[PDB]
Design an enzyme around this catalytic site. Structure first.
Site, PDB file in Angstrom:
ATOM      1  N   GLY A  43       4.381 -26.134  12.696  1.00  0.00           N
ATOM      2  CA  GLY A  43       3.990 -25.886  11.316  1.00  0.00           C
ATOM      3  C   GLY A  43       2.913 -26.825  10.823  1.00  0.00           C
ATOM      4  O   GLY A  43       2.456 -27.712  11.556  1.00  0.00           O
ATOM      5  N   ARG A  44       2.503 -26.625   9.559  1.00  0.00           N
ATOM      6  CA  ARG A  44       1.466 -27.414   8.907  1.00  0.00           C
ATOM      7  C   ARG A  44       1.793 -27.634   7.435  1.00  0.00           C
ATOM      8  O   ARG A  44       2.202 -26.701   6.741  1.00  0.00           O
ATOM      9  CB  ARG A  44       0.102 -26.722   9.057  1.00  0.00           C
ATOM     10  N   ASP A 153      12.394 -35.419  -2.810  1.00  0.00           N
ATOM     11  CA  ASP A 153      11.843 -34.143  -2.350  1.00  0.00           C
ATOM     12  C   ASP A 153      12.926 -33.255  -1.705  1.00  0.00           C
ATOM     13  O   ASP A 153      12.689 -32.578  -0.698  1.00  0.00           O
ATOM     14  CB  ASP A 153      10.591 -34.320  -1.453  1.00  0.00           C
TER      15      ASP A 153
END
Length: 324
Positions: A43-44, A153
């Site tokens: 992923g990115r 987060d």
């Protein structure tokens, strides 16, 4: 604004040495990036590319997160927090910190987690499955809060689950921070849908309780099958979405308690709203996942007043978890 402090683990960093929490003074030691063979892109993110890799010295799968070095002080904070929490229950294990000999790009190497898809999970998940995994996240949060760290987060993208092995890991400590009582923090943290009212009203003296709001949002999405639960279109709208469920009366009670000055941008969008009953979100598609215990638990997390929310330890003692 009126000052505030955490109800639990208030002074855990005050009683520790400077080295534990002074991430700017921390000495980072790079490994051999040559010990890892990158296999495939997983992923990115904004400033990170994640790859599946092989540690050649032991033929073990690892995850390599290559960081675009946009802020060095931030990379140091993440590395220090990952080192302090290493081996904590359900905390992602930082296995190594490598710099590529030629690129010199920082890279964090983690234990491999064979993640099962969340879009696929929330349909096959039972009432018990939700309770078990919620208890597993609370283990991670009670641990990191006890270690004087707020994750900042908490969201489903930051919770990796290996359903076959019933293994859960809390990941991406890039926004995490050390809790110091009385400190004023940057409110530009968490992801929009999971942002606590404290961030949306610019109340800087927040604490671990921010994570408990985010957890409440995740719970509300799972039991009611509504993702996200509070679907804001920007940060200002996000508070309006919350206000449409907890009412504007309790919001003004919250801002009066802490003498918070509301941004003029809320004047033409907030309006006037009533407090809604959690039972109104129960429908045919989700009723097999809802119970009085689940609703009482959610009500105790999703509160404006950050001080009034259950701590991770109080949450673990809730009747909702008597079955786990």
């Amino acid at each position: 604004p009126v000052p505030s402090r955490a109800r639990v683990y208030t002074d855990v960093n005050t009683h520790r040495p400077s080295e534990y929490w002074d991430y700017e003074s921390h000495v980072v030691e790079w490994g051999n990036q040559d010990d890892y063979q990158l296999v495939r892109k997983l992923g990115r993110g904004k400033y990170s590319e994640v790859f599946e890799a092989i540690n050649i010295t032991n033929n073990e799968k690892v995850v390599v997160k290559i960081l675009k070095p946009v802020k060095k002080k931030k990379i140091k904070r993440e590395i220090k927090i990952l080192e302090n929490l290493r081996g904590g229950p359900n905390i992602i294990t930082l296995a190594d910190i490598v710099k590529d000999p030629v690129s010199r790009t920082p890279a964090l190497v983690f234990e491999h987690v064979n993640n099962t898809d969340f879009k696929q999970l929330y349909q096959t998940l039972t009432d018990y499955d939700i309770r078990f995994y919620m208890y597993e996240i609370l283990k991670a949060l009670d641990y990191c809060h006890s270690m004087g760290i707020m994750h900042r987060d908490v969201k489903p993208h930051n919770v990796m689950i290996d359903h076959e092995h019933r293994k859960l890991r809390l990941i991406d400590w890039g926004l995490a921070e050390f809790y110091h009582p009385g400190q004023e923090y940057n409110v530009r943290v968490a992801s929009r849908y999971f942002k606590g009212p404290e961030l949306l009203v610019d109340y800087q003296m927040y604490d671990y309780s921010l994570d408990m709001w985010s957890l409440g949002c995740m719970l509300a999405s799972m039991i009611f099958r509504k993702e996200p639960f509070f679907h804001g279109h920007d940060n200002y709208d996000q508070l309006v979405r919350i206000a449409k469920v907890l009412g504007t009366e309790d919001l003004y009670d919250y801002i009066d308690k802490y003498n918070i000055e509301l941004d003029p941008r809320f004047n033409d969008i907030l309006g006037r709203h009533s407090r809604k009953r959690w039972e109104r979100f129960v429908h045919s598609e989700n009723q097999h996942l809802v119970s009085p215990e689940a609703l009482d638990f959610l009500d105790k997390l999703l509160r404006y007043d950050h001080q009034s929310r259950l701590t991770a330890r109080e949450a673990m003692e809730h009747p909702y978890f008597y079955t786990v």
